[PDB]
C-alpha cells in the first residue's frame, strides 16, 4: 500500500517488496521497503559479497581471484551463508 522510492533509479516499491541496489558506488545491497510513513527502507549485504580488495560486488556462486600478502593467487567464491561471507583458497 505505502511505497518506498528510489529517486536515483526513478523506481518505487510497495511495503514488503525487496530489490537490489548499488551502495557507495560499487557495493550491492538488498533493500526491503518498510514504509512507516517515510518511505523507510532497510538494506543488507548479508546475501552478497562486497570484497573491499577488488572493489567489486559478487553474488552467491560467483568466483574471483586476488592476491594474499606474499604474491600468492587466491581463488575466492561467494557463499553468502546469511553473513555476507566468502571463502578463498591460497
Amino acid at each position: 500500500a505505502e511505497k518506498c522510492f528510489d529517486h536515483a533509479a526513478g523506481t518505487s516499491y510497495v511495503v514488503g517488496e525487496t530489490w537490489e541496489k548499488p551502495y557507495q558506488g560499487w557495493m550491492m545491497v538488498d533493500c526491503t521497503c518498510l514504509g512507516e510513513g517515510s518511505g523507510r527502507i532497510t538494506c543488507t549485504s548479508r546475501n552478497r559479497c562486497n570484497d573491499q580488495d577488488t572493489r567489486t560486488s559478487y553474488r552467491i556462486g560467483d568466483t574471483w581471484s586476488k592476491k594474499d600478502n606474499r604474491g600468492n593467487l587466491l581463488q575466492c567464491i561467494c557463499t553468502g551463508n546469511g553473513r555476507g561471507e566468502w571463502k578463498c583458497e591460497r
Binding site: 523507510r40 527502507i41 532497510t42 538494506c43 594474499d68 555476507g84 566468502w86
Partner: peptide
C-alpha cells in the same frame, strides 16, 4: 598446507525515501 580463508562484510542500514 593452507586452510580456507573465510572473509565477511556484513552490514545493514535504514534510510527514509520521502521527505
Amino acid at each position: 598446507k593452507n586452510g580456507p580463508i573465510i572473509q565477511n562484510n556484513k552490514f545493514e542500514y535504514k534510510e527514509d525515501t520521502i521527505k
